[PDB]
């Protein structure tokens, strides 16, 4: 079977975002004209949320739970796929091959991914995805 | 064919004082002391020279910006790319093995 | 034997020799069986095991080094891992080997 499909969680091993957790939105096994290799569009976490305790209150909690996202085109050789999954139904339409040729579409995609990630984190779902990998 | 000598107190051919011969704008040959060459920073895991980091004397790093002595990747400026990749892969696999071992222990203690 | 089946696969079937080719075929889901030499490094072996678990690909631990596995395959160079895309004329897949 194939495991590099939409919704699969991966760990980036090369590049500036090495060690960060991403989710695959659109796999391209045959590549593109601009990326002639097996690659994938991913949405990942650049700044993980900080832990919140009972001492923190109001504005501090709102500051600690902010999540910074990123959207990337990553070669398969630079990804380590996991066995975990995360739903990409909220933002599977904003991350496409066109998005990475238009910076405004990049801005909109990052905004949408940030909103979706913050909502999912505040819902308490996917505690493993929103936790830093210690390496 | 003019002969030159040291310009400082040390009269011995030590590593500290090394002489180059240069022709000054006066038309004469004169000695010049050369400083010790700088050494490239090395990776903390494999010892290979770090890529993308300028080579300077220890005290010259205090005067340059952070982009000239770091790399944008994690552990950038301390470890090279391959070592970081191995660290990530090893950490993930160790965590997975811990999960599997915990499940096995739970199953094997569930008999009683 | 197991060397005869491997030799027949190389003669008639489809195969990939090496770690990079094996991982690429595992990602593409075209692998039927992966034979792992005993000489392979532990990190690459564990990565291959995890990839096989993800892709549900059968694993056979070869009883020998990468050079013995290369000679068994029929190549005068070391091979650390072999992936069987198509058995072809041989029957290595049928006999659970």
């Amino acid at each position: 079977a194939k495991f590099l499909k939409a919704g699969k969680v991966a760990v980036v091993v090369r590049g500036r975002y090495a060690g960060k957790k991403v989710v695959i939105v659109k796999p391209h096994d045959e590549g593109s004209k601009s990326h002639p290799f097996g690659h994938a569009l991913v949405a990942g976490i650049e700044r993980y949320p900080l832990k919140v305790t009972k001492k923190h209150g109001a504005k501090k909690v709102a500051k600690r739970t902010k999540i910074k996202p990123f959207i990337k085109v990553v070669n398969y050789n630079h990804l380590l796929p996991t066995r975990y999954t995360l739903d990409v139904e909220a933002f599977k339409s904003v991350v496409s091959t066109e998005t990475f040729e238009q910076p405004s579409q990049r801005e909109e995609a990052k905004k949408v991914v940030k909103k979706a990630f913050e909502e999912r984190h505040q819902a308490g779902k996917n505690q493993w995805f929103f936790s830093k990998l210690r390496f | 064919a003019q002969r030159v000598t040291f310009r400082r107190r040390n009269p011995y051919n030590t590593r500290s004082n090394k002489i180059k011969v240069v022709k000054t704008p006066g038309g004469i040959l004169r000695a010049q002391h050369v400083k010790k060459l700088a050494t490239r920073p090395k990776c903390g895991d494999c010892g290979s020279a770090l890529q993308g980091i300028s080579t300077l004397r220890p005290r010259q790093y205090a005067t340059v910006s952070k982009t000239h002595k770091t790399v944008s990747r994690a552990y950038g400026g301390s470890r090279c790319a391959n070592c970081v990749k191995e660290r990530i892969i090893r950490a993930f696999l160790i965590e997975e093995q811990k999960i599997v071992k915990k499940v096995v222990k739970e199953q094997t203690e569930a008999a009683k | 034997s197991i060397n005869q089946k491997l030799a027949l696969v190389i003669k008639s079937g489809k195969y990939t020799l090496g770690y990079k080719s094996t991982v690429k075929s595992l990602r593409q889901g075209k692998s039927k069986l992966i034979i792992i030499a005993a000489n392979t490094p532990v990190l690459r072996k564990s990565e291959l095991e995890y990839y096989a678990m993800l892709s549900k690909t059968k694993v056979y631990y070869f009883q020998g080094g990468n050079n013995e596995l290369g000679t068994a395959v029929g190549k005068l160079f070391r091979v650390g891992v072999v992936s069987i895309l198509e058995a072809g004329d041989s029957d290595i897949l049928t006999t659970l080997a």
Binding site: T82, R83, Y84, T85, Q127, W128, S131, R134 | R90, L93, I94, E95, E96, Q97, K98, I99, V100, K101, K102, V103, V104, Q107 | V42, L43, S46, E49, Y50, A52, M53, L54, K56, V59
Partner: peptide, 28 residues
């Protein structure tokens, strides 16, 4: 500290669940 092993991955007797991402744990 030991790396992932397929033998101990099968000793638990549940490989479909693991490959499906069933047991998720956070340590430390």
């Amino acid at each position: 500290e030991s790396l992932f092993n397929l033998k101990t991955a099968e000793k638990t007797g549940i490989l479909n669940d693991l490959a499906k991402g069933k047991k998720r744990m956070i340590f430390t």
